[PDB]
Design an enzyme around this catalytic site. Structure first.
Site, PDB file in Angstrom:
ATOM      1  CG  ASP A 113      -2.177   0.700   1.111  1.00  7.47           C
ATOM      2  OD1 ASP A 113      -1.944   1.864   0.540  1.00  7.47           O
ATOM      3  OD2 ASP A 113      -3.159   0.621   1.545  1.00  7.47           O
ATOM      4  CB  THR A 170      -6.471   1.720   0.586  1.00  9.08           C
ATOM      5  OG1 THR A 170      -5.248   2.296   0.767  1.00  9.08           O
ATOM      6  CG2 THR A 170      -6.325   0.123   0.960  1.00  9.08           C
ATOM      7  CG  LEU A 201     -11.504   2.096   5.849  1.00 10.79           C
ATOM      8  CD1 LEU A 201      -9.705   2.081   5.484  1.00 10.79           C
ATOM      9  CD2 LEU A 201     -12.069   1.365   4.851  1.00 10.79           C
ATOM     10  CE  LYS A 205     -13.038  -4.251   6.328  1.00 15.60           C
ATOM     11  NZ  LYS A 205     -11.939  -4.681   7.233  1.00 15.60           N
ATOM     12  CG  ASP A 261      -3.081   1.177  -2.529  1.00 15.28           C
ATOM     13  OD1 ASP A 261      -1.834   1.145  -2.383  1.00 15.28           O
ATOM     14  OD2 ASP A 261      -3.623   1.756  -1.548  1.00 15.28           O
ATOM     15  CB  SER A 319       0.180  14.244   6.714  1.00 13.66           C
ATOM     16  OG  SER A 319       0.432  14.335   8.327  1.00 13.66           O
ATOM     17  NE  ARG A 347     -22.186   0.395 -21.231  1.00 15.42           N
ATOM     18  CZ  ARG A 347     -22.598  -1.175 -21.506  1.00 15.42           C
ATOM     19  NH1 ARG A 347     -21.351  -1.776 -22.175  1.00 15.42           N
ATOM     20  NH2 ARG A 347     -23.533  -1.667 -21.139  1.00 15.42           N
TER      21      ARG A 347
HETATM   22  C1  LIG Z   1     -17.992  -1.147 -16.940  1.00 11.54           C
HETATM   23  O1  LIG Z   1     -18.455  -2.384 -16.856  1.00 11.54           O
HETATM   24  C2  LIG Z   1     -19.609  -2.727 -16.197  1.00 11.54           C
HETATM   25  C3  LIG Z   1     -19.884  -4.183 -16.076  1.00 11.54           C
HETATM   26  O2  LIG Z   1     -19.550  -4.869 -17.122  1.00 11.54           O
HETATM   27  C4  LIG Z   1     -21.013  -2.121 -16.764  1.00 11.54           C
HETATM   28  O3  LIG Z   1     -21.961  -1.958 -15.893  1.00 11.54           O
HETATM   29  C5  LIG Z   1     -23.090  -2.506 -16.498  1.00 11.54           C
HETATM   30  O4  LIG Z   1     -24.016  -1.593 -16.889  1.00 11.54           O
HETATM   31  C6  LIG Z   1     -25.213  -2.068 -17.422  1.00 11.54           C
HETATM   32  C7  LIG Z   1     -25.900  -0.967 -18.104  1.00 11.54           C
HETATM   33  O5  LIG Z   1     -25.362   0.194 -17.795  1.00 11.54           O
HETATM   34  C8  LIG Z   1     -26.162  -2.807 -16.411  1.00 11.54           C
HETATM   35  O6  LIG Z   1     -27.046  -3.167 -16.938  1.00 11.54           O
HETATM   36  C9  LIG Z   1     -28.434  -2.754 -16.597  1.00 11.54           C
HETATM   37  O7  LIG Z   1     -28.749  -3.265 -15.219  1.00 11.54           O
HETATM   38  C10 LIG Z   1     -29.872  -2.215 -14.602  1.00 11.54           C
HETATM   39  C11 LIG Z   1     -30.334  -2.576 -13.127  1.00 11.54           C
HETATM   40  O8  LIG Z   1     -30.491  -4.027 -13.130  1.00 11.54           O
HETATM   41  C12 LIG Z   1     -31.573  -4.127 -11.920  1.00 11.54           C
HETATM   42  O9  LIG Z   1     -32.214  -3.045 -11.957  1.00 11.54           O
HETATM   43  C13 LIG Z   1     -33.818  -2.868 -11.940  1.00 11.54           C
HETATM   44  C14 LIG Z   1     -34.186  -2.935 -10.452  1.00 11.54           C
HETATM   45  O10 LIG Z   1     -34.958  -1.630 -10.326  1.00 11.54           O
HETATM   46  C15 LIG Z   1     -34.230  -4.055 -12.646  1.00 11.54           C
HETATM   47  O11 LIG Z   1     -35.255  -3.551 -13.793  1.00 11.54           O
HETATM   48  C16 LIG Z   1     -33.468  -5.223 -13.162  1.00 11.54           C
HETATM   49  O12 LIG Z   1     -34.394  -6.463 -13.353  1.00 11.54           O
HETATM   50  C17 LIG Z   1     -33.948  -7.174 -14.593  1.00 11.54           C
HETATM   51  O13 LIG Z   1     -34.137  -6.537 -15.737  1.00 11.54           O
HETATM   52  C18 LIG Z   1     -34.265  -7.341 -17.079  1.00 11.54           C
HETATM   53  C19 LIG Z   1     -35.636  -7.301 -17.351  1.00 11.54           C
HETATM   54  O14 LIG Z   1     -35.547  -8.225 -18.388  1.00 11.54           O
HETATM   55  C20 LIG Z   1     -33.469  -8.663 -16.882  1.00 11.54           C
HETATM   56  O15 LIG Z   1     -33.007  -9.194 -17.814  1.00 11.54           O
HETATM   57  C21 LIG Z   1     -32.339  -8.479 -15.703  1.00 11.54           C
HETATM   58  O16 LIG Z   1     -31.584 -10.034 -15.407  1.00 11.54           O
HETATM   59  C22 LIG Z   1     -32.940  -7.987 -14.063  1.00 11.54           C
HETATM   60  O17 LIG Z   1     -33.290  -9.180 -13.402  1.00 11.54           O
HETATM   61  C23 LIG Z   1     -32.346  -5.421 -12.316  1.00 11.54           C
HETATM   62  O18 LIG Z   1     -32.708  -6.045 -11.196  1.00 11.54           O
HETATM   63  C24 LIG Z   1     -31.130  -2.329 -15.745  1.00 11.54           C
HETATM   64  O19 LIG Z   1     -31.860  -1.131 -15.345  1.00 11.54           O
HETATM   65  C25 LIG Z   1     -30.713  -1.973 -17.147  1.00 11.54           C
HETATM   66  O20 LIG Z   1     -31.640  -2.326 -17.926  1.00 11.54           O
HETATM   67  C26 LIG Z   1     -31.384  -1.547 -19.226  1.00 11.54           C
HETATM   68  O21 LIG Z   1     -31.096  -2.303 -20.284  1.00 11.54           O
HETATM   69  C27 LIG Z   1     -32.275  -3.541 -20.410  1.00 11.54           C
HETATM   70  C28 LIG Z   1     -31.452  -4.260 -21.456  1.00 11.54           C
HETATM   71  O22 LIG Z   1     -30.379  -4.920 -21.126  1.00 11.54           O
HETATM   72  C29 LIG Z   1     -33.528  -3.110 -20.814  1.00 11.54           C
HETATM   73  O23 LIG Z   1     -34.114  -3.951 -21.009  1.00 11.54           O
HETATM   74  C30 LIG Z   1     -34.051  -1.766 -19.892  1.00 11.54           C
HETATM   75  O24 LIG Z   1     -34.771  -1.013 -20.573  1.00 11.54           O
HETATM   76  C31 LIG Z   1     -32.729  -0.753 -19.572  1.00 11.54           C
HETATM   77  O25 LIG Z   1     -32.503   0.399 -20.623  1.00 11.54           O
HETATM   78  C32 LIG Z   1     -29.518  -3.006 -17.386  1.00 11.54           C
HETATM   79  O26 LIG Z   1     -29.817  -4.424 -17.366  1.00 11.54           O
HETATM   80  C33 LIG Z   1     -25.143  -3.865 -15.824  1.00 11.54           C
HETATM   81  O27 LIG Z   1     -25.852  -4.430 -14.627  1.00 11.54           O
HETATM   82  C34 LIG Z   1     -23.828  -3.323 -15.359  1.00 11.54           C
HETATM   83  N1  LIG Z   1     -23.029  -4.435 -14.837  1.00 11.54           N
HETATM   84  C35 LIG Z   1     -22.662  -4.387 -13.487  1.00 11.54           C
HETATM   85  C36 LIG Z   1     -22.355  -5.869 -13.038  1.00 11.54           C
HETATM   86  O28 LIG Z   1     -22.193  -3.441 -12.945  1.00 11.54           O
HETATM   87  C37 LIG Z   1     -20.429  -0.638 -17.289  1.00 11.54           C
HETATM   88  O29 LIG Z   1     -21.473  -0.169 -18.204  1.00 11.54           O
HETATM   89  C38 LIG Z   1     -19.140  -0.427 -17.802  1.00 11.54           C
HETATM   90  N2  LIG Z   1     -18.593   1.228 -17.554  1.00 11.54           N
HETATM   91  C39 LIG Z   1     -18.238   1.810 -18.705  1.00 11.54           C
HETATM   92  C40 LIG Z   1     -18.337   3.396 -18.510  1.00 11.54           C
HETATM   93  O30 LIG Z   1     -17.940   1.076 -19.553  1.00 11.54           O
HETATM   94  C1  TMP Z   2      -6.893  -4.112   3.746  1.00 10.92           C
HETATM   95  C2  TMP Z   2      -7.358  -3.069   4.664  1.00 10.92           C
HETATM   96  C3  TMP Z   2      -6.743  -1.852   4.896  1.00 10.92           C
HETATM   97  N1  TMP Z   2      -7.336  -1.070   6.158  1.00 10.92           N
HETATM   98  C4  TMP Z   2      -6.509   0.239   6.561  1.00 10.92           C
HETATM   99  C5  TMP Z   2      -5.390   0.033   6.537  1.00 10.92           C
HETATM  100  C6  TMP Z   2      -4.516   1.013   5.878  1.00 10.92           C
HETATM  101  O1  TMP Z   2      -3.584   1.694   6.673  1.00 10.92           O
HETATM  102  C7  TMP Z   2      -5.637   2.055   5.459  1.00 10.92           C
HETATM  103  C8  TMP Z   2      -5.192   2.474   4.384  1.00 10.92           C
HETATM  104  O2  TMP Z   2      -5.277   3.927   4.045  1.00 10.92           O
HETATM  105  P1  TMP Z   2      -5.354   4.666   2.876  1.00 10.92           P
HETATM  106  O3  TMP Z   2      -6.797   4.342   2.365  1.00 10.92           O
HETATM  107  O4  TMP Z   2      -5.366   6.341   3.298  1.00 10.92           O
HETATM  108  O5  TMP Z   2      -4.138   4.373   1.777  1.00 10.92           O
HETATM  109  O6  TMP Z   2      -6.573   1.184   5.524  1.00 10.92           O
HETATM  110  C9  TMP Z   2      -8.696  -1.384   6.660  1.00 10.92           C
HETATM  111  O7  TMP Z   2      -9.064  -0.836   7.621  1.00 10.92           O
HETATM  112  N2  TMP Z   2      -9.285  -2.603   6.410  1.00 10.92           N
HETATM  113  C10 TMP Z   2      -8.505  -3.646   5.223  1.00 10.92           C
HETATM  114  O8  TMP Z   2      -9.294  -4.519   5.035  1.00 10.92           O
HETATM  115 CA    CA Z   3     -25.657   6.551 -21.749  1.00 12.84          CA
HETATM  116 ZN    ZN Z   4      -3.556   2.870   0.360  1.00 12.83          ZN
HETATM  117 ZN    ZN Z   5      -2.864   6.003   2.649  1.00 13.89          ZN
END
Ligand SMILES: *[C@@H]1O[C@H](CO)[C@@H](O[C@@H]2O[C@H](CO)[C@@H](O[C@@H]3O[C@H](CO[C@H]4O[C@H](CO)[C@@H](O)[C@H](O[C@H]5O[C@H](CO)[C@@H](O)[C@H](O)[C@@H]5O)[C@@H]4O)[C@@H](O)[C@H](O[C@H]4O[C@H](CO)[C@@H](O)[C@H](O)[C@@H]4O)[C@@H]3O)[C@H](O)[C@H]2NC(C)=O)[C@H](O)[C@H]1NC(C)=O
Ligand code: TMP
Ligand code: CA
Ligand code: ZN
Ligand code: ZN
Ligand code: NAG
Ligand code: NAG
Length: 706
Positions: free
Chosen positions: A31, A69, A103, A108, A236, A345, A590
């Site tokens: 860290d 961290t 933490l 947590k 980190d 610090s 996106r």
């Molecule tokens: C980085 O990488 C991450 C991960 O790869 C990316 O994050 C992902 O983003 C996408 C879209 O931005 C996410 O998918 C969406 O999920 C939401 C929320 O899901 C839940 O929300 C509701 C609760 O109120 C509920 O509606 C949902 O229920 C079901 O929905 C459908 C229905 O058929 C079903 O198929 C699902 O399995 C659920 O059970 C659920 O509980 C949801 O709102 C989104 O729906 C949009 O798109 C769908 C089509 O896919 C469409 O039907 C809708 O109308 C709506 O437009 C969508 O499912 C995904 O979850 C994220 N992944 C994670 C794990 O975080 C991120 O985009 C990346 N970032 C960048 C900048 O690249």
């Molecule tokens: C990995 C871990 C670190 N810590 C603490 C120890 C580290 O000194 C501190 C990190 O400080 P920092 O986020 O400012 O870098 O967080 C927890 O409280 N729980 C944890 O699981």
């Molecule tokens: Ca968008």
């Molecule tokens: Zn740290």
């Molecule tokens: Zn620190």
């Protein structure tokens, strides 16, 4: 002879003892190990230096934002942006839960905070045992899964005992022995805070951590596994020297108010006190506007959550406050001088592109090349790297899978380019000829390759209707569903008003007429391709080359093309430019679907207009300055995602020094080419000669500040 005393040995083929089928993977974290530490103090760290010289090293590893961290340590094992995996900061708050996070707290261990899927959970679903020791998220069970061997965080446990604990686990029976391991040390973060990055305590700390890694390697050697283990020595974040003179207190502009709460640090956030009663009811916009441009050289800047630079990816989470603060290097912000721990610090949390926030990465083992130094990469790319090392199918993450293939001796995954989902159609001459109401003062295959020399952008939009409109200076991908250009590509070499012409290839829209634009309304049209190209180029005045643009933004857009673009053409011997509008109203990073696009279309001047949130621009040149953009051996990319704002409050134009603030806005909103791809649904450089893995490396690159 100890491991550090022996010379380098090429481990082309893993030499594993019996009961081992494949080399395990250990993730060793230190860290607060700023990247500058190893650059400068390499001669004082003999163990770490040997790992560098015999493994895969990178001068700088770019961490996530903010540089804390927990968010970063968890982003490593999930490969997700902090905005998506839930752990935004060490201390945060969720309105929908009405609960704070810390933490040193009972919250947590609450599984409702941890999103995504960490590597040990991934390993569990694919039948791979994992034994962790003090990794953020290891104490808590995520998706009802806990590592086969875990330890609830206890900072009192001596470092020497932590190493031995893992060494003891390596001796477990073949059926009960983990294949993935983690190790965590609080140094040199602890010494960095209390005494500063440049101190005797950090030198002593670096040396302390160095011998400890040496203890592990000697222990691995005595077990006959020194040539049978994949080691990833990572950190980190970095460390920056804080100052009392360089600290910002909000009370000076607001007063000793108690209606607002401020999370102090270089990445400050603000929420109202009456929460969640007024979490959304509080208008941050007024407070943000009331805090901008109060000082001649203000070292902090009020940002609405979507108005932050897109490269940070720090908006689409409930836990992120709607009001954030961007600070200059070496500067922190707080409400009152009482809330902060200390001002002078060592701190961290600053912009992840800052020089001293950079982290460490060393890959050693049979799977990593020997003495190979690679370019910078984000820590979210590491998640996919471990899946290949553990033989796992990776969960959906934000890292470009395969972009780190150059680190491995024998790459496991071979990436491919994304198929074109767009419904590609053609636009012949069909609609002649409307009156635009404008005042004007007095073969094909050869010209295509000249405008898109690396290959045309592929349409990843599903299933958008796009036409390819060919001109003599540029090629533009026009959208039929939005009736405006998605992108316009042209090549600008080293040395080469109120009027418009109707493009008969596209259907006429009321917003194409100059009669639509009055001199009173702040909204107007801008060109994607500058008309002052190569007399004056008239095809740039086509209706299909204009986009809705605020008058305040035109100040940035024209200076970008009239001054900067020409300077870059001389420095880099010509540049290839691809520009276009960006529509991301839900600020998730996106491209928006057609459904949400229709929801954000305002009506102005009696006509319906879909106005862009941003404008992207990608500059491409040759790595060899002797070559023009049409004959590059290697590419030189730099992308930007510029915010489309009705005013220039962000820039503090006041004082009127135009050539300065524009460039400062450009440099701040620089972005990965991948970022542009993700937000526009386009794919670049597909016909380029370099391989997919190389092109992923190119598109995920960002320059380090200072
Ligand atoms: C980085 O990488 C991450 C991960 O790869 C990316 O994050 C992902 O983003 C996408 C879209 O931005 C996410 O998918 C969406 O999920 C939401 C929320 O899901 C839940 O929300 C509701 C609760 O109120 C509920 O509606 C949902 O229920 C079901 O929905 C459908 C229905 O058929 C079903 O198929 C699902 O399995 C659920 O059970 C659920 O509980 C949801 O709102 C989104 O729906 C949009 O798109 C769908 C089509 O896919 C469409 O039907 C809708 O109308 C709506 O437009 C969508 O499912 C995904 O979850 C994220 N992944 C994670 C794990 O975080 C991120 O985009 C990346 N970032 C960048 C900048 O690249
Ligand atoms: C990995 C871990 C670190 N810590 C603490 C120890 C580290 O000194 C501190 C990190 O400080 P920092 O986020 O400012 O870098 O967080 C927890 O409280 N729980 C944890 O699981
Ligand atoms: Ca968008
Ligand atoms: Zn740290
Ligand atoms: Zn620190
Ligand atoms: C939110 O939590 C705080 C303390 O946890 C409590 O005082 C307050 O009443 C809660 N508000 C709601 C709406 O539950
Ligand atoms: C933490 O670890 C130390 C060393 O093993 C031990 O003595 C101490 O009792 C532990 N504290 C807790 C919280 O159990």
């Amino acid at each position: 002879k100890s491991w550090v005393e022996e010379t380098c040995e090429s481990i082309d083929t893993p030499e594993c003892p019996a009961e081992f089928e494949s080399p395990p993977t250990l993730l060793f974290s230190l860290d607060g190990f700023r990247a500058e530490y190893l650059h400068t103090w390499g001669g004082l760290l003999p163990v770490i230096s040997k790992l560098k010289n015999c493994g895969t090293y990178t001068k700088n590893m770019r961490p996530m934002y903010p540089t804390k961290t927990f968010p970063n340590h968890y982003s490593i094992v999930t490969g997700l942006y902090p905005e998506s995996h839930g752990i935004i900061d060490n201390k945060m708050y969720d309105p929908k839960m009405n609960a704070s996070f810390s933490l040193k707290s009972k919250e947590k261990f609450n599984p409702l905070w941890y999103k995504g899927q960490p590597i040990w959970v991934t390993a569990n679903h694919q039948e791979v045992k994992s034994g962790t020791y003090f990794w953020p998220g290891s104490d808590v069970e995520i998706d009802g899964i806990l590592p086969d061997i875990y330890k609830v965080y206890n900072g009192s446990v001596p470092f020497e005992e932590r190493i031995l604990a893992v060494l003891e686990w390596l001796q477990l029976p073949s059926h009960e022995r983990p294949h993935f391991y983690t190790l965590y040390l609080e140094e040199p973060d602890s010494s960095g805070h209390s005494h500063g990055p440049v101190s005797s305590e950090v030198i002593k700390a670096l040396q302390k951590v160095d011998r400890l890694v040496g203890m592990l390697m000697d222990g691995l050697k005595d077990l006959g596994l020194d040539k049978c283990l994949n080691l990833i020595l990572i950190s980190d974040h970095g460390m920056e020297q804080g100052s009392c003179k360089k600290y910002v207190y909000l009370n000076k502009y607001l007063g000793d108010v108690n209606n607002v709460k401020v999370v102090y640090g270089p990445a400050a956030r603000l929420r109202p006190t009456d929460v969640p009663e007024t979490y959304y009811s509080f208008n941050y916009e007024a407070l943000a506007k009331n805090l901008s441009c109060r000082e001649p050289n203000q070292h902090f800047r009020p940002y609405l959550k979507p108005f932050l630079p897109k490269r940070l990816h720090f908006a689409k989470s409930d836990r992120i406050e709607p009001l954030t603060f961007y600070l200059d290097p070496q500067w922190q912000l707080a409400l009152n001088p009482s809330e902060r721990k200390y001002c002078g610090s060592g701190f961290h949390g600053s912009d992840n592109l800052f020089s001293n926030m950079q982290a460490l990465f060393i890959g050693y083992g049979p799977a990593f090349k020997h003495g190979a130094e690679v370019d910078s990469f984000e820590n979210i790319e590491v998640y996919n790297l471990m899946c290949d090392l553990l033989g796992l199918i990776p969960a959906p993450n934000n890292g470009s899978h395969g972009s780190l293939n150059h680190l491995l001796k024998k790459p496991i995954y071979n990436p491919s380019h994304p198929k074109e989902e767009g419904f590609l159609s053609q636009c012949p001459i069909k609609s002649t000829s409307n009156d635009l109401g404008c005042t004007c003062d007095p073969e094909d295959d050869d010209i295509y390759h000249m405008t898109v020399p690396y290959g045309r952008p592929r349409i990843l939009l599903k299933q958008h209707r796009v036409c390819l409109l060919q001109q003599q200076q540029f090629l533009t991908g026009y959208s039929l569903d939005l009736l405006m250009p998605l992108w316009a590509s042209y090549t600008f070499l080293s040395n080469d008003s109120n009027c418009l012409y109707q493009d008969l290839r596209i259907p006429l829209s009321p917003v194409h007429k100059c009669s639509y634009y009055k001199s009173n309304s702040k909204l107007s049209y801008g060109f994607l391709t500058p008309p002052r190209l190569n007399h004056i180029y008239s095809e740039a005045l086509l209706t299909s080359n204009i986009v809705p643009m605020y008058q305040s933004f035109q100040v940035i857009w024209h200076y970008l093309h009239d001054t900067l673009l020409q300077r870059y053409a001389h420095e880099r011997n010509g540049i290839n430019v691809v520009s276009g509008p960006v529509f991301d109203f839900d600020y998730d990073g996106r491209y928006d679907s057609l459904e949400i696009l229709k929801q954000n279309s305002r009506v102005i001047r009696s006509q319906e207009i879909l106005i862009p949130t941003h404008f992207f621009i990608v500059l491409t040149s040759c790595k060899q300055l002797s070559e023009t953009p049409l004959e590059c051996s290697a590419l030189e990319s730099s992308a930007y995602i510029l915010p489309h704002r009705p005013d220039n409050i962000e820039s503090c134009t006041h004082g009127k020094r135009e050539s300065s603030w524009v460039e400062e806005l450009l440099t701040l909103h620089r972005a990965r080419v991948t970022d542009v791809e993700l937000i526009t649904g386009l794919s670049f450089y597909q016909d380029r000669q370099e391989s997919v893995s190389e092109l992923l490396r190119l598109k995920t690159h960002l320059p380090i500040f200072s």
